[PDB]
């Protein structure tokens, strides 16, 4: 009786939201950006190849100086690279080799990683002893760690396969906030530029916008037909793009609370692993299972170019803060740095 | 390059030296993924031979490393991609419990038809045969109740039952095996092959059966690249 009545009200509320979104869908992003000229052909060359990982690379993250990056592989090794010289700055042996994510702190003093061990380990890069040591092991998740991002040296947000995201206080080792509401494994998260909000994509084909301080879900974005594997905020923080296993990328708007554009091609039938934006946000770069990275025109949904330099799955990619280069990691155990030439 | 860059480059080369030394020891070991349910008894199989539970055992100067993932929920369609380069998947089921056999068959279908497990052979184990033999002999529960096709199933002549086994056991035991193999042969196009086996909680030959099956899995890969198969 009460349960039947309540679940009927949820359907009415969903129709209310759908009507509200349809009410503000006066125009389409495609119509708005039809007049603007295309970006042309985007040609990027492999400037650097980072060799030394002996297994599948699963994650990478640039440091804020746009020169150092950290990559994680399932050979049980965290490596910090000097991208200008390809020198290895550090090699951190992981207690658990089944790592799935890695993050570089914006200060550059810490790195984080974690995988099937359900632990987010914090490593101190600046010690008087001259070596990298474990500073914290964040326990509390009941599923695998899928993504992690530092807010500062003391706060980090993690997404897990137990359908929840958590905000952690690194100094005390306790999760201050728990983000619940996803019905599937959360596979990725992206921080807003002001670090007041973050979006997460799960296997329920939905993206939820969370308030860091308040700790609740503000908005829910649907439209994908399969598990979401990747998510990335637009550089101004008013939009984000997702990547799913249905070979499509979708651009959702926070304020319009709906999808604005779909990035898919008929030839593409493989899942998407990673997504990122260029510094101005005009380019959307996506990594695919078909060993390639496709550069999309974010405004016009045109495939601007292709980065074909890997012989296995493109598992991760990231663009530097200054926008100078893009790094791609792959299951072939190599990292490559790309940028164009005049 | 400056004097500090040369010293930094020397540091980088020392790291690569230690990366190869640590990475060379992992190439000689074969990686195995252990799958099953709570009642499958896969913990008994590893214990007899001996987030992530690991086990290392040696069979004739060959090192096997079997990984059991007991810290995750039922939805394994996502983290199964990590075990894309394992040699074999050791899938364990409980034969005695006919009620959950359909669940095991549905579970095995997802693993076999997985997108990222197209080239991974499955060393299927049907654990707890002694309990199955007693259950069939008692006759309280009949497989025909759960599987209607069992009443119309006849034991093939090519079957070679173990000595001292009642014909009733052979008809039931091979019917359960035929259900799993029928799923294997349906798809895959010969890329990977299932290796069903029947074991019990007191069986001590589990390690050797994995050894022989892993030999066939590697042998098929060598013949495949030489275009001999």
């Amino acid at each position: 009786s009460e349960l039947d009545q309540l679940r009927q009200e949820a359907e009415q509320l969903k129709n209310q939201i759908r009507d509200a979104r349809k009410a503000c869908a006066d125009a389409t992003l495609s119509q708005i950006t039809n007049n603007i000229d295309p970006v042309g052909r985007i040609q990027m060359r492999t400037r650097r190849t980072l060799r030394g990982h002996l297994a599948k690379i699963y994650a990478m993250h640039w440091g804020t100086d746009s020169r150092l990056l950290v990559s994680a592989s399932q050979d049980g090794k965290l490596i910090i690279w000097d991208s200008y010289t390809t020198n290895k700055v550090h090699a951190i042996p992981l207690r658990s080799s089944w790592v799935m994510t890695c993050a570089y702190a914006p200060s550059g003093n810490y790195v984080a990683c974690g995988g099937l061990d359900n632990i987010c380990s914090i490593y101190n890069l600046k010690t008087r002893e001259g070596n990298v040591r474990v500073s914290r092991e964040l326990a509390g998740h009941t599923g695998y760690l899928s993504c992690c991002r530092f807010l500062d040296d003391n706060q980090i947000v993690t997404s897990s396969g137990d359908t929840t995201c958590a905000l952690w206080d690194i100094e005390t080792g306790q999760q201050t906030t728990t983000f619940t509401g996803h019905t599937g494994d959360v596979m990725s998260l992206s921080l807003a530029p002001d670090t007041r909000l973050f979006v997460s994509g799960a296997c329920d084909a939905s993206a939820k916008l969370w308030d860091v301080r308040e700790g609740m879900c503000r908005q829910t974005f649907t439209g994908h037909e399969s598990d979401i594997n990747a998510i990335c905020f637009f550089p101004n923080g008013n939009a984000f793009a997702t990547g799913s296993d249905d070979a499509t990328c979708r651009l959702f708007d926070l304020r319009a609370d709906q999808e604005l554009m779909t990035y898919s091609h008929d030839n593409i039938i493989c899942g998407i692993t990673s997504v990122s934006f260029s510094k101005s946000g005009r380019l959307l770069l996506a990594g695919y299972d078909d060993f390639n990275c496709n550069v999309w025109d974010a405004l016009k949904a045109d495939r601007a170019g292709v980065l074909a330099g890997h012989d296995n799955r493109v598992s991760c990619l990231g663009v530097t803060d200054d926008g100078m280069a893009v790094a791609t990691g792959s299951w072939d155990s190599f990292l490559k740095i790309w940028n164009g030439s005049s | 390059v400056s004097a500090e860059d040369k010293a930094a480059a020397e540091r980088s080369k020392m790291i690569d030296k230690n990366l190869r030394e640590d990475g060379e020891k992992a190439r000689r070991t074969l990686r195995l993924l252990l799958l099953g349910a709570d009642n499958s008894g896969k913990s008994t199989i590893v214990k007899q031979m001996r987030g992530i539970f690991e086990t290392k055992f040696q069979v004739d100067k060959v090192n096997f490393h079997m990984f059991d993932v007991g810290g995750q929920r039922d939805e394994r369609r996502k983290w199964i991609q990590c075990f894309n380069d394992v040699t074999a998947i050791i899938f364990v089921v409980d034969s005695s419990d006919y009620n959950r056999l359909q669940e095991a068959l549905n579970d095995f279908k997802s693993i076999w038809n997985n997108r990222w497990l197209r080239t991974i052979s499955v060393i299927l184990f049907l654990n707890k045969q002694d309990l199955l033999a007693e259950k069939v002999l008692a006759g309280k529960s009949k497989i025909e109740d759960y599987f209607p096709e069992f009443a119309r199933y006849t034991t093939p002549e090519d079957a070679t039952p173990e000595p001292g086994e009642d014909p009733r056991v052979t008809r039931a035991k091979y019917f359960i095996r035929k259900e799993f193999v029928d799923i294997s042969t349906a798809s895959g196009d010969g890329r990977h092959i299932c290796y069903p086996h029947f074991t019990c909680a007191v069986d001590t030959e589990n390690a050797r059966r994995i050894f022989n099956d892993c030999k066939d899995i590697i042998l098929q890969m060598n013949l495949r690249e030489y275009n001999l198969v």
Epitope: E129, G130 | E4
Partner: single-chain antibody, 231 residues
Framework: DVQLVESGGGLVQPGGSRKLSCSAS????????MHWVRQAPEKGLEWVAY????????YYADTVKGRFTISRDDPKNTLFLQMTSLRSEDTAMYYC??????????????WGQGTTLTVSDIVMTQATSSVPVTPGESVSISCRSS???????????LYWFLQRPGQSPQLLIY???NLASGVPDRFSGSGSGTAFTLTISRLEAEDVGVYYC?????????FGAGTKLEL
């Protein structure tokens, strides 16, 4: 805590041989390159030798090349300096200095207490030998180099050290602008090309000492004469 203890020094006859040891504790010794730096009595610092991490690279100063041999024992965390044909010019306090080299590292960050031995090229100029100072007043120290220390990679390999009376030198500024760990923010290093300035805002009693500027553009590493601060 990080420690570097030197031993083996003492009065030796001319033409003799002596073995200096540097025992390291509290840090990963095998990860750090090691230098020997000596200081003649009432004189400035003089670099002697360098051995890299892993013992693959070894450098010597010309005044000691062929007579001194530097070696390390990684399992024992001991640094060695075998000296032969010792002359009266070798009478100095020998310092054990650790230095690690990677992007953003701080070489020469920790110095040992030193051991005393008694026997019976880019030019770095610090023209101002002494500077009378008062607490709370801003002081600037100038350093000059015969060659430009700015490399094509953007680094300017200039270092600043402070040797308080009775104490070993301590790193203040590395690569001409970066502030060493544990150093108050009042110290600031500014430079361009061949001219460099060390600014000390709100001078205190602890800042009293001798200041040395060192170049790390190329070997042999050379020190300036040194500027002394007195009250």
């Amino acid at each position: 805590d990080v420690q570097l203890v030197e031993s083996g020094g003492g009065l030796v006859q001319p033409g003799g041989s002596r073995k200096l040891s540097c025992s390291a504790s509290g840090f990963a010794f095998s990860s750090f390159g090691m230098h020997w730096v000596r200081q003649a009595p009432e004189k400035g610092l003089e670099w002697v030798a360098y051995i890299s991490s892993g013992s693959g690279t070894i450098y010597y100063a010309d005044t000691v090349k062929g007579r001194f041999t530097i070696s390390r024992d990684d399992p024992k965390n001991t640094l060695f300096l075998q000296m032969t044909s010792l002359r009266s010019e070798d009478t100095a306090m020998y310092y054990c200095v650790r230095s690690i080299y990677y992007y953003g590292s701080s070489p020469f960050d920790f110095w040992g207490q030193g051991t005393t031995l008694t026997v019976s090229d880019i030019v770095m100029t610090q023209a101002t030998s002494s500077v009378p100072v008062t607490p709370g007043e801003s002081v600037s120290i100038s350093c000059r180099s015969s060659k430009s220390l700015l490399h094509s990679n953007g680094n300017t390999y200039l270092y600043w050290f402070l040797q308080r009376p009775g104490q070993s030198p301590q790193l203040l500024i590395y690569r001409m602008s970066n502030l060493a760990s544990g150093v108050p923010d009042r110290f600031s290093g500014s430079g361009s090309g061949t001219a460099f300035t060390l600014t000390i805002s709100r001078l205190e009693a602890e800042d009293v000492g001798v200041y040395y500027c060192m170049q790390h553009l190329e070997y042999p590493l050379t020190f300036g004469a040194g500027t002394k601060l007195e009250l």
